[PDB]
Design a protein around this motif. Structure first.
Motif: not given
Ligand SMILES: Nc1ncnc2c1ncn2[C@@H]1O[C@H](COP(=O)(O)OC(=O)[C@@H](N)Cc2c[nH]c3ccccc23)[C@@H](O)[C@H]1O
Ligand SMILES: CC(=O)NCc1cccc(Oc2ccc(-n3c(=O)n(C4CCNCC4)c4ncnc(N)c43)cc2)c1
Ligand SMILES: O=c1[nH]c2cc(Cl)ccc2o1
Lengths: 333, 323
Positions: B6-17, B190-199
């Protein structure tokens, strides 16, 4: 459409004349004037640990008591809380619009926690949120309860107003309907204590299903006061026991306190208790005769529960859908 | 029996690499080994006040991205939490078997959902006879509570619940681009720490260009988390994309500067993201496909959840509903 009445009672303990006068009596009287919905709140009852067989039996006992009291399934919706998922669903959502401090300050949570120190559970803490869900699901205008539930009802109004202020006219703001007599019937041997449906000392209580002869004995042993001469007069602070007796008599007979005071002029506690015992004994005898006719008819109890959950579900699902749309959930297919 | 995850996927926040390469990519390849359940937990979301339309959108965004990453609604069960009433129902019931003290040990102005969601999470898990939960590191106390509740209920009523276990094994280290000592987290401000899957490729290039490195002279592309955390992170990201070993990349970048490494990292990351993004936008904009996925998933989930709930209700002693 008529304004909507909603109220519930727990299938735990044994409902008392206190539960009757503070609640059930009003429930019965409001059935034509308003659109009434009455609930056996088994999900609330389990905030105090229940034996599983006692809980199932008590749920059916309570349903039969509603019917015996005169709650008419052709006029009112009668249902078991756990039969309608929307109660738990809205309850969770309303958790997020209720503040911890609003819940920690509840008198019921404090009193129940002191009684059950071994089971201070999250359900007991969260009790008022589920109760607000119970009320708000039905666009409820009037909630007939005893005085002890006033704090809980006030929170449901706060919650309804908070939610509506953010999202629109999703809920009706409910109003308490608390009777003038019998809103807080007291214990027979400790008249400063509310009469409990789960008292360890049965001599404090008048149970709705208790042997009437047993009840009459408890009435004669109810504490009064040392006034010399004994005088039948309403004064909760100085004559709590006599006052509580007068309150019960007034609630069973419909007679006012001033009338009763005049009726007992020149009389003492023997006349008072004799006629509290007469009135209550007759009420309980007739109530219990109807009760067994309903309680032993499983087919009828089963039908009432089925129809009632169906009617409740239609109302509740409509409200939950509006709640879910307002807070931003993807609507179910 | 094939274990239930079982995994709970929280809607808010875009997934990162980091979310993809570090966990989801591997779970996508375990869909036949386990009965995997992916619950988009919108009821958990509302513990935090947030815009309603954005929550609805993020629910659908999360669904399409999980599908885009390769969750197969035919092999796995994917559904929106609120579409399955049993979650709230079991949540209330389990409140009554959870100590208040347990929740306080996890003020007056926090909402009750913030205080009570660990019980909802226990219900989420216990409904499905779940064997395995891939909790976050911040959710380990929560899983312990769920196990405690399951055992407590089982001790009173019989073996109603499976006692869930954490999914222990980990699949790739992806650290924050500007703080290489911090895991890349989808909730980072800080969005610059991350790369989102939609970038888009231009966004990836820009963020990789600013990724911290070191002042080694000459610059040297070599793996050393202690002394060269930024370069090591770039190497880990590149290896996780291409499958090339760290030693192979070290050989490949001998005599090369960090600009070369960064250029390859961006190219490799964006190449990985393009098939993901194509699938995403195609799923995300097929409203009827998404609707069918949620309908089928909620139906599968509710069939399982209702079995557990009915056993719970029977054990508590509730009168059974009359249909
Ligand atoms: N000694 C007394 N004198 C007068 N009235 C009394 C006395 N003791 C109890 N009451 C009233 O009886 C009703 C049922 O009490 P319960 O404890 O079952 O049940 C309760 O105390 C509710 N929380 C159940 C509930 C759950 N959800 C609801 C929604 C609306 C109204 C009620 C509910 C109540 O009206 C209570 O005020
Ligand atoms: C990653 C994963 O699959 N975990 C297993 C699992 C199982 C069931 C539900 C489930 O969904 C949720 C969703 C959210 C939370 N949750 C949650 O984990 N936190 C955190 C946030 C920071 N670290 C400590 C506590 C929550 N804070 C507020 N509200 C919540 N609802 C919070 C908790 C659980 C997750
Ligand atoms: O009122 C409430 N509180 C609740 C908590 C959970 Cl976990 C579920 C339903 C609820 O309804």
């Amino acid at each position: 459409t008529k304004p909507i009445v909603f109220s519930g009672a727990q299938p735990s303990g044994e409902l008392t004349i206190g539960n009757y006068m503070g609640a059930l009596r009003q429930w019965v009287n409001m059935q034509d004037d308003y659109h009434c919905i009455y609930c056996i709140v088994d999900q609330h009852a389990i905030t105090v640990r229940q034996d599983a067989q006692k809980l199932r039996k008590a749920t059916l006992d309570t349903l039969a008591l509603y019917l015996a009291c005169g709650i008419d399934p052709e006029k009112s919706t009668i249902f078991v809380q756990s039969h309608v998922p929307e109660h738990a669903q809205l309850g969770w959502a309303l958790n997020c619009y209720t503040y911890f401090g609003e819940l920690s300050r509840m008198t019921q949570f404090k009193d129940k926690s002191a009684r059950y120190a071994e089971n201070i559970n999250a359900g007991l803490f969260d009790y008022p949120v589920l109760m607000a869900a119970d009320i708000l699901l039905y666009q409820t205008n009037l909630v007939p309860v005893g005085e002890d539930q006033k704090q809980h009802l006030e929170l449901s109004r706060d919650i309804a107003q908070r939610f509506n202020a953010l999202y629109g006219e999703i809920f009706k703001v409910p109003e308490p309907f608390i009777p003038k007599s019998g809103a807080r019937v007291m214990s027979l041997l400790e008249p400063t204590k509310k009469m409990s449906k789960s008292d360890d000392n049965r001599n404090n209580v008048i149970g709705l299903l208790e042997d009437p002869k047993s009840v009459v004995k408890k009435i004669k042993r109810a504490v009064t006061d040392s006034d010399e001469p004994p005088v039948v007069r309403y004064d909760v602070q100085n004559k709590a026991g006599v006052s509580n007796l007068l309150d019960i008599l007034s609630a069973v007979t419909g007679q006012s306190i001033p009338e009763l005071e005049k009726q007992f002029e020149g009389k003492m506690y023997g006349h008072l208790k004799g006629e509290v015992a007469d009135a209550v004994s007759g009420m309980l005898t007739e109530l219990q005769e109807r009760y067994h006719r309903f309680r032993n008819d499983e087919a009828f109890l089963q039908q009432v529960m089925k129809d009632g959950a169906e009617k409740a579900s239609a109302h509740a699902s409509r409200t939950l859908k509006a709640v879910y749309e307002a807070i931003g959930f993807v609507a179910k297919r």
